[PDB]
Amino acid sequence: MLSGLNHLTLAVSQLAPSVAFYQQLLGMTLHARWDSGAYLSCGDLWLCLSLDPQRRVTPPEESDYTHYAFSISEADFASFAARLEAAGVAVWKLNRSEGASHYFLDPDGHKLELHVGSLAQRLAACREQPYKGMVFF
Amino acid sequence: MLSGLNHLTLAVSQLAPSVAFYQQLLGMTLHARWDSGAYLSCGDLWLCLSLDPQRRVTPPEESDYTHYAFSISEADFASFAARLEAAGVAVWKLNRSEGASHYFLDPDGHKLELHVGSLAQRLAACREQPYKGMVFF
Numbered sequence: 204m205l206s207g208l209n210h211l212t213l214a215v216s217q218l219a220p221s222v223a224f225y226q227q228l229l230g231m232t233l234h235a236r237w238d239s240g241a242y243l244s245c246g247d248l249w250l251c252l253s254l255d256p257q258r259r260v261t262p263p264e265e266s267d268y269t270h271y272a273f274s275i276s277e278a279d280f281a282s283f284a285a286r287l288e289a290a291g292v293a294v295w296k297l298n299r300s301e302g303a304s305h306y307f308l309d310p311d312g313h314k315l316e317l318h319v320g321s322l323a324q325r326l327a328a329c330r331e332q333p334y335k336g337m338v339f340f
Numbered sequence: 341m342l343s344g345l346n347h348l349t350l351a352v353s354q355l356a357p358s359v360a361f362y363q364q365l366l367g368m369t370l371h372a373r374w375d376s377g378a379y380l381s382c383g384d385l386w387l388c389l390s391l392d393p394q395r396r397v398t399p400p401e402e403s404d405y406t407h408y409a410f411s412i413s414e415a416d417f418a419s420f421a422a423r424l425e426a427a428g429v430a431v432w433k434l435n436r437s438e439g440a441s442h443y444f445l446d447p448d449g450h451k452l453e454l455h456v457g458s459l460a461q462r463l464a465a466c467r468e469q470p471y472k473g474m475v476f477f
């Protein structure tokens with residue numbers, strides 16, 4: 204039986220800028236680094252950065268919608284978004300759904316999101332206003 | 341302040357086979373599905389499957405090392421891995437370079453993993469068998 208997400212591993216083209224982004228800009232805790240990767244944590248999330256010559260710096264128009272959303276409180280959302288903007292971090296989408304969301308790119312074009320709200324909150328909103336063809340279980 | 345992973349969203353090319361893979365084969369909990377997506381949970385993880393015409397079925401030699409690992413207990417690991425193998429689930433990696441792991445592919449080629457152990461346990465193991473150049477903070 205699967206019990207949760209164990210870790211998220213992102214392939215990176217250059218380890219130093221990716222460590223700077225996740226540790227310094229995004230505030231994650233750096234636990235270890237080696238010649239070809241790093242381990243960080245963000246709350247319960249175990250993040251691994253893996254140096255990979257196969258990683259392309261990928262424009263957002265050229266990748267699919269797969270993305271990784273980090274939790275932040277509503278009270279902290281606007282100042283964190285402003286921090287990313289000050290740092291010149293690109294946005295790949297505007298929010299049009301329930302709950303605050305900021306959609307931003309990592310140095311290699313990994314699609315990231317800041318989101319306020321849980322699955323339970325989303326499901327409650329969907330029950331009141333179901334998406335097209337929506338069924339609940 | 342970021343506090344963890346809010347959700348993981350995977351772009352999928354065909355919604356029904358992907359829902360079947362995550363719910364029926366992997367045992368995740370299906371909460372809702374609609375014409376363009378589905379919401380599942382795996383413990384605390386919120387998983388969203390999003391139908392995306394841009395998603396390509398991608399062989400593992402064509403994608404980088406970005407991957408998603410799910411937690412499983414030591415007691416359940418081997419029989420779950422063997423069940424996936426007997427079901428014909430494609431793989432992408434054999435060498436256990438980060439502990440007790442089974443590396444497998446979803447229907448679109450998303451790189452998945454079963455892993456036994458926490459970040460703390462992996463750091464302890466690495467102190468004895470470190471990756472080249474490893475520093476611990």
Ligand SMILES: CNCc1ccc(O)cc1
Binds near residue numbers: 335375
């Ligand atoms: C047509 N709405 C999407 C959907 C929902 C439930 C289901 O059994 C199949 C498809």
Ligand SMILES: [Mn+2]
Binds near residue numbers: 270272316347349
């Ligand atoms: Mn999202």
Ligand SMILES: [Mn+2]
Binds near residue numbers: 212409438453
């Ligand atoms: Mn892994």
